[PDB]
Structure to design on (1078 residues):
């Protein structure tokens, strides 16, 4: 029956945001799915799920390349010029909402795409040695760096390292080569 | 077997790669650059481990700047 | 049963009498079989002076092609007709085809055994042992008098060359249910056999 | 046929295997070891392999015709390695063949009629590489950068170190 | 102390190609030369050093794709004959070294796939029912992670297999055009 | 500790005590399991350590002389 | 006109346009907000206080919390940079005098910052690179009076437990020492104490 689609907007946008939370942001704990059904009683007796499938289809369709909003309106109209399609005002409303959560969606997609340990922060220290048990006088300095590594959804590991002048210079040279390779490949 | 110079770790080799992710199951135009690193490190036992992680461009440039500052500070004293 | 272009060219070259005679063809075929089969081989497979007149490049390309063809035929359980037809499509005669078929037949069984020995499997049990006891008491229970069964399985993992043993404790009812399950499995096997 | 003949063959095999009774493993001939166990099952592993090529362009052919290049099947010690590596080599060769000359269907063979070697394809993948390299060109200044802070680095050199420690110092335990 | 190949002079001109080519074979994935073949010419603790030096020099030269002269000039102070052996060795099997280097690039990751084997079976009957006839594909994987080889097993039916093939073909449609 | 990420400069004493441990082979399996440890201390912890150890030493000496 | 010493991280007009928004708010709210900044810094274990206190401001004047958060973010930059560089009072004073952002506000802000600056500076020392810190220790000194293979023996021994902070987790290291080893350890610690107070 023609309930909600042409009448209520609040349930529709609520479902869109709940789906965004459920599928992109990784917070499926408590969603509006279980509350709207008994708080909004407009559940169709027979055809209630398949329209959620079109919800999912449109949600994934725009998630491909994130085009400029000038080109999103054309596709939204083309997909939605049929029965039960979204309105022009509602098309603008949903087009706005993409800007409201674009960067977060992209980051969650990249975050929910990682395959190896990622860098979650660098903390270092540079010291000056004095002496030891047998040695009585030393001045050569060192550097201490600790790496925050961890795959998404798992406890982070820590790695500690030691350095002196020569090795620091070598690492700086290697990073400089990395930068040069990054620079020369644009053209 | 007792030396003060080696306390915790000392990396023996440093390798890296440059590549970008093109497509994914949940996104066909992912297309962002990234840079990876492989560290093989030796502990007091004399063994060699292998730790590898992935970074982005802003993180890599932060890494490079921090190592530059470390080099300056260690040089001055 | 698909084949690559390089193997096709190798078998095309194998037919030419100028490149290979009957003796050279037989020696190459036997050398390929030895290389595929023996576990103590070396370069000696090609150190047979009768073959020391042709370029080694073609020699080794055809050696690899013949080994690949034998491997594919063994994997696909090919018979006389398929090999004969393909070799006939390769411009062979009734002598080379016959010798190839005979060489395949001579040591077919070893090749069939070899390719069937690759792969993993779940742990395979071998035998069982049981100890019968009569429980009497525990620290906080002083009169039970109930029989209990001890079982020990002997299994060997293809993943680790060892003989770990699995142990569990069963009662009479549990033992009866287990025996019933195994008997049902045996009856299912018999049903499969009858059909 | 097969849907029934396969069942008949399976039944015959099961009957034959049931015919042989169980024997202790310590008294097991290799055939029974195959039947009543899996002790002699090896894994599948493929090792990189190099083969001579019918290309006589020069210097490399000297190596290809030398004893240094061992015959292809005997480049590995174990026969299982030999068979596995040869099978994977053939499969990979055929896969590279699939993306090359192939007498296929009425439409898949269409491009094969007039396809230059990896040249006519370069026009329509240069567009993809353009997107890749233009995405790389971004983020080198898009955010965070410019990082030009040449103030913390070299100034420390001028000042140097001013203070220092003196003589060895110690005290009495409290 | 000059080029890392300076330790190679002790070995005469005759036994150079064998050592070098067997080392390259070891790099590609085959076995390495054994001590009991050239023991008289080197000591083990330094034999390892020269082995590593040769391997790393070859890897660097192939990876950076140097021109003819610069490779030639670095070998000026070697034996009168070893230089041409080295240059011919580089000219012959450069592509194998490049392939090994490209393979090692994939080693920059948490885990890598080494090899696999699949077995197909026909499930006939089970305790639930005696008319099952369920084809099942068993997939075995040997994936190397950290520094160890971890085996895995997956059991699939026709539907899961079809979905997996569909996803892998979707990925292959990108892989094929990326080349 | 001359400098750190969150502070450009200082001059603070620090200690790095390293130790060697031998555990019974039986309690760890088939390995010898000889490990090395490192602990980075400060002034207050070292002072407490030394006060406690000196207290124990004084107790031992008093017992000896008693 | 050379570089500006107020800023280490560049602050273009895009981020520096909002630096003047603090001028509208009054002095009472300014003082309350600064004291709240310090108190929130001291107790991050109870963040519910922040929402509880901003509830009144939201209900009364409907002030959008985004602007307050932005001004708070931008205002903390200078003292954070001072912490990371340990600036002298004259440096911060001269920077604020030259820039001159509501000097009536800035004098009080800098004064209260300097009054409480040393504790903030000290708090930064703990948050640095300390490899396997030592937190707690225990010991037990006793005498053996027998064993499985000797009926009588008086072998002395000492046991230690070290609570070492192995990263975000915690580990305990259990050791046993003999009499000469304990005495040598004590002497070595005395030597380390002597050498650790040489510079200052």
């Amino acid at each position: 029956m023609a309930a909600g689609e042409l009448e209520g907007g609040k349930p529709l946008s609520g479902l869109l945001n709940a789906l965004a939370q459920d599928t992109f942001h990784g917070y499926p704990g408590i969603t509006e799915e279980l509350l709207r059904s008994q708080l909004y009683p407009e559940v169709p007796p027979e055809e209630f799920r398949p329209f959620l499938a079109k919800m999912r289809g449109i949600l994934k369709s725009i998630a491909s390349a994130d085009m400029d909003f000038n080109q999103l309106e054309a596709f939204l109209t083309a997909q939605t010029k049929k029965q039960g399609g979204i309105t022009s005002d509602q098309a603008a409303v949903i087009s706005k909402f993409w800007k409201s959560h674009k960067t977060k969606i992209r980051e969650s997609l990249m975050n929910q795409s990682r395959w190896n340990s990622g860098l979650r922060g660098l903390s270092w220290r540079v010291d000056g040695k004095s002496q030891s048990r047998h040695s009585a006088q030393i001045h050569t300095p060192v550097a201490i760096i600790e790496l925050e590594l961890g795959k998404y959804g798992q406890e982070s590991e820590f790695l500690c390292l030691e350095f002196d002048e020569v090795k620091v210079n070598q690492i700086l040279k290697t990073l400089s080569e990395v930068e040069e390779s990054i620079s020369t490949l644009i053209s | 077997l007792d030396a003060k110079s080696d306390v915790t770790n000392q990396l023996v080799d440093f390798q890296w790669k440059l590549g970008m992710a093109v497509s994914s199951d949940t996104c066909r135009s992912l297309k962002y650059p990234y840079v990876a690193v492989m560290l093989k490190v030796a502990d007091h036992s004399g063994q060699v481990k292998t730790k590898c992680f992935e970074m982005t461009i802003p993180q890599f440039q932060n890494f490079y700047r921090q190592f530059k500052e470390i080099a300056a500070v260690i040089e001055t004293v | 049963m698909e084949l690559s272009e390089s193997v096709q060219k190798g078998f095309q070259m194998l037919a030419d009498p100028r490149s290979f005679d009957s003796n050279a063809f037989t020696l190459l075929l036997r050398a390929a079989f030895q290389s595929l089969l023996d576990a103590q081989a070396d370069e000696a497979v090609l150190d047979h002076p009768d073959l020391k007149h042709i370029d080694p490049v073609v020699l080794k390309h055809c050696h690899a092609a013949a080994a690949t063809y034998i491997l594919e035929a063994g994997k696909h359980r090919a018979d006389k007709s398929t090999l004969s037809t393909y070799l006939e499509d390769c411009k062979f005669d009734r002598e080379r085809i016959e010798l190839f078929c005979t060489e395949y037949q001579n040591n077919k069984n070893s090749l069939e055994i070899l390719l069937g020995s690759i792969g993993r499997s779940l742990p395979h049990i071998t035998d069982v042992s049981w100890r019968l006891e009569y429980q009497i008491k525990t620290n906080q229970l002083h009169r039970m008098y109930r029989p209990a069964y001890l079982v020990t399985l002997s299994v060997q993992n293809t993943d680790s060359p060892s003989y770990p043993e699995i142990s569990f404790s069963c009662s009479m009812e549990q033992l009866q249910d287990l025996v019933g399950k195994l008997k049902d499995a045996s009856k299912s096997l018999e049903r499969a056999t009858q059909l | 046929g097969d849907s029934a003949i396969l069942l008949r063959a399976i039944g015959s095999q099961i009957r034959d295997q049931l015919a042989l009774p169980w024997v202790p493993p310590h008294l097991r001939t290799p055939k029974l070891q195959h039947l009543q166990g899996s002790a002699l099952q090896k894994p599948f592993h493929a090792s990189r392999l190099v083969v001579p090529e019918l290309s006589s362009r020069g210097e490399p052919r000297e190596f290809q015709a030398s004893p240094l290049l061992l015959p292809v099947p005997t480049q590995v010690p174990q026969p299982v390695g030999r068979v596995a590596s040869l099978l994977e080599h053939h499969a990979l060769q055929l896969c590279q063949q699939t993306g090359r000359d192939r007498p296929g269907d009425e439409d898949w063979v269409h491009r094969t009629s007039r396809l230059p070697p990896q040249e006519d394809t370069r026009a329509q993948r240069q567009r993809l590489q353009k997107q890749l390299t233009e995405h790389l060109r971004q983020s080198w200044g898009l955010l965070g950068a410019p990082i030009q802070a040449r103030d913390l680095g070299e100034l420390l050199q001028a000042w140097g170190a001013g203070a220092k420690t003196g003589a060895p110092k110690g005290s009495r335990f409290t | 102390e000059g080029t890392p190949l300076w330790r190679l002079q002790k070995l005469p001109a005759e036994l150079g190609p064998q050592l070098l080519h067997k080392i390259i074979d070891g790099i590609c994935g085959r076995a390495y030369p054994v001590y009991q073949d050239y023991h008289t010419v080197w000591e083990s603790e330094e034999w390892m050093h020269v082995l590593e030096d040769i391997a790393k020099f070859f890897k660097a030269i192939v990876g950076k794709n140097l021109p003819d002269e610069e490779i030639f000039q670095q070998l000026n102070q070697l034996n009168s004959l070893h230089q041409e052996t080295i240059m011919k060795c580089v000219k012959s099997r450069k592509d194998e070294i490049k392939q090994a280097l490209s393979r090692e690039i994939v080693a920059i990751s948490s885990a890598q796939l080494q090899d696999f084997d699949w077995q197909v079976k026909l499930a006939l009957s089970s305790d639930k029912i005696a008319a099952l006839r369920m084809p099942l594909l068993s997939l075995h994987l040997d994936v190397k992670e950290n520094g160890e080889v971890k085996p895995y097993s997956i059991e699939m039916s026709r539907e899961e297999l079809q979905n997996l093939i569909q996803s892998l073909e979707a990925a292959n449609k990108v892989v094929l055009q990326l080349k | 500790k001359t400098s750190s990420d969150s502070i450009s400069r200082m001059a603070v004493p620090t200690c790095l005590l390293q130790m060697k441990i031998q555990e019974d082979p039986s309690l760890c399996g088939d390995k010898p399991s000889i490990s090395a440890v490192t602990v980075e201390l400060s002034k207050e912890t070292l002072d407490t350590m030394l006060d406690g150890l000196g207290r124990i030493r004084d107790q031992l000496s008093a017992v000896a002389s008693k | 006109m050379g570089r500006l010493h107020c800023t280490e991280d560049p602050v273009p007009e895009a981020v520096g346009g909002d630096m003047q928004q603090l001028n509208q708010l009054g002095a009472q709210q300014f003082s309350a907000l600064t004291e709240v900044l310090f108190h929130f810094l001291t107790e991050p274990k109870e963040v519910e206080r922040f929402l509880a206190q901003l509830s009144e401001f939201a209900t009364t004047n409907q002030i959008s919390l985004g602007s307050l958060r932005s001004i708070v973010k931008s205002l903390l930059l200078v003292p954070n940079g001072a912490l990371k560089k340990s600036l002298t009072a004259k440096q911060v004073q001269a920077d604020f005098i030259t820039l001159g952002l509501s000097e009536e506000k800035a004098t009080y802000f800098s004064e209260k910052w300097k009054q409480n600056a040393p504790t903030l500076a000290r708090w930064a020392i703990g948050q640095t690179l300390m490899i396997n810190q030592l937190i707690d220790m225990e010991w037990k000194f006793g005498v053996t009076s027998g064993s499985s293979e000797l009926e009588k023996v008086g072998s002395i021994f000492l046991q230690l437990k070290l609570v070492v902070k192995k990263g975000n987790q915690t580990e305990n290291v259990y050791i046993e020492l003999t009499l000469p080893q304990f005495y040598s350890f004590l002497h070595e610690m005395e030597r380390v104490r002597t050498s650790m107070e040489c510079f200052c």
Observations:
- Chain D touches chain C through 49 residues (CB under 8 Å).
- The CA atoms of residues 147 and 161 of chain D lie 28 Å apart.
